Every structure is written in C-alpha cells, then in structure tokens.
A paper describes a structure:
Immunoglobulin G (IgG) antibodies contain a complex N-glycan embedded in the hydrophobic pocket between its heavy chain protomers. Unlike other glycoproteins, IgG harbors two glycans which are buried in the cleft between the two heavy chains, and are thus not solvent exposed or readily accessible on the surface of the molecule to conventional probes. We previously described an approach to overcome this challenge and successfully identified synthetic nanobodies that can distinguish fucosylated and afucosylated IgG glycoforms. In the present study, we present the crystal structures of the afucosylated IgG-specific nanobody X0 in isolation, as well as in complex with afucosylated IgG1 Fc.
However, glycoform-specific nanobodies deviate in CDR sequence from these published models, likely resulting in significantly different loop architecture and requiring that we solve the structure of our clones in isolation. Superposition of the apo and bound structures of X0 revealed minimal changes in the CDR1 and CDR2 loop position upon binding to IgG Fc. However, consistent with an induced-fit model, the CDR3 loop undergoes a large conformational shift, curling downwards and wrapping around the IgG C’E loop to gain better access to the buried N-glycan at N297. This is demonstrated by several CDR3 residues that in some cases move >9 Å upon binding.
Residue numbers in the entry: 1 to 120
C-alpha cells in the first residue's frame, strides 16, 4: 500500500514554533518532490511548502521567512519547521507527493492530516 504518515501538530501560543514530520512509502517519493498543504474549515486546501529531490525549496508567500521545509532523502521523510506562528496559521496540515506528473492536486497522495492551532 501507498502511505504518507504525518506527526508533530498541536496547540501553541502565537509566536511559538512547531515541527511537522512526514514519512513516505518506500517508493512513491524517491526522485520526486515532497510538499506540505494546509486546510482551514470551510476553505480549500492550499500550498504551504515543497522541496525537490535535488533540494530546491519553495514556499507560499504567506509563510516565506517563517517556515522551513527540509528532507532526508535516504529516510523518505520530509519536515516542516514552523516558526513565528500566527493565528492565521491554524489549519489541518497535510504532507503530499504527486501520484501523477502534472502538479494537479487531484492526483496527489495525502497524509492523514495533523491539526495545528495557534491561539492569540
């Protein structure tokens, strides 16, 4: 079976930090880009951060300078270090890998989701 498995969420005061981690099935992530998305109630799922196999990172404008995505290619694991958290960051966070080849999120594999709540 194909599995992505996340952890690290929680409840934290504004200005704090969290670290999300995600472990991927032995073959769906190698040579491929791994990413993080988030979804607040009543909103569509939206991009947060991604890191290519070669190590290039890119971020949503709203988290640039605050979040850092990294990855251990050998362990098939991706991480999201979340600093300077804001109430607007509250959402369910999902790690993701494209099961297709078009960056079309209808084709993505998703983790189960991990709740992040930032109290003001």
């Amino acid at each position: 079976q194909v599995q992505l498995q996340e952890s690290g969420g929680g409840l934290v005061q504004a200005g704090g930090s969290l670290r999300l981690s995600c472990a991927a099935s032995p073959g769906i992530s190698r040579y491929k880009t791994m990413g993080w998305y988030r979804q607040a109630p009543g909103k569509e799922r939206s991009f947060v951060a991604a890191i290519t196999w070669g190590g290039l990172t890119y971020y949503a404008d709203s988290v640039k300078g605050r979040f850092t995505v990294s990855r251990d290619n050998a362990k098939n694991t991706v991480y999201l270090q979340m600093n300077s958290l804001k109430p607007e960051d509250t959402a369910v966070y999902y790690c993701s890998v494209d099961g297709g080849t078009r960056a079309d999120p209808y084709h993505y594999y998703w983790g189960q989701g991990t709740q992040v709540t930032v109290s003001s």
